[PDB]
């Protein structure tokens, strides 16, 4: 009964830190082992594989993995985490001399290094002449996280990281909105623990 196990469906790494994605297998005889990467709405790309040749296997872009029989492991590493490393990673193993079986996947999230945070909540108006608006919570660092709404008529998105290449500038943001006319941007993120210095323009 051969299997492959990846630890954690979602993992974080700080921008610039060592990348470590863990994979363990249960085969008695050593198997062939594979690491694949998948970007959004994209297919599977092979990074590297262990095919009973070298134990230290090297792949594209600084990826490596060492096959360790004594700990039944084949962990994927890269020396430094870059924003372009954000993807889902799958470990896989040969099985029954006839197929590859896949682990469940781990999505790697890269936490940008935000040296000068400028947390703020802004109100944005519809380009067309409704008075519809949304609220944008932006420019907070890595220690802020955004909580789900506790009010079923207010919608709040997960934090997303954008990378403005023109300015070599990354920033976090979350969006909130509601069809209540009274809903105010000062209250939109009241269920989240926000920075004490968040900017709330009048």
């Amino acid at each position: 009964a051969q299997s492959v196990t990846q630890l954690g469906s979602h993992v974080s790494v700080s921008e610039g830190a060592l990348v470590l994605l863990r994979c363990n297998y249960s085969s008695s005889v050593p198997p062939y082992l594979f690491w694949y990467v998948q970007y959004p709405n994209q297919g599977l790309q092979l990074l590297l594989k262990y095919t009973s040749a070298a134990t230290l296997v090297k792949g594209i872009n600084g990826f490596e993995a060492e096959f360790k029989k004594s700990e039944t492991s084949f962990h994927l590493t890269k020396p430094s985490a870059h924003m372009s490393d954000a993807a889902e990673y799958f470990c896989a193993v040969s099985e029954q001399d006839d197929k590859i079986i896949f682990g469940k996947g781990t999505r790697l999230h890269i936490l940008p290094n935000i040296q000068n945070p400028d947390p703020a909540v802004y109100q944005l108006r519809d380009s067309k002449s409704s008075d519809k608006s949304v609220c944008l919570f932006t420019d907070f660092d890595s220690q802020t996280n955004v909580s789900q709404s506790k009010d079923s008529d207010v919608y709040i998105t997960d934090k997303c990281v954008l990378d403005m290449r023109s300015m070599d500038f990354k920033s976090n943001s979350a969006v909130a909105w509601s069809n209540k006319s009274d809903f105010a941007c000062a209250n939109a993120f009241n269920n989240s623990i926000i920075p004490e210095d968040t900017f709330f323009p009048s």
């Binding site: 802004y122 109100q123 944005l124 519809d126 380009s127 944008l136 323009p201």
Partner: peptide, 9 residues
């Protein structure tokens, strides 16, 4: 819908 940038931002 597109929502335009805030003056405050």
């Amino acid at each position: 819908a597109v929502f335009e940038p805030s003056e405050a931002e």
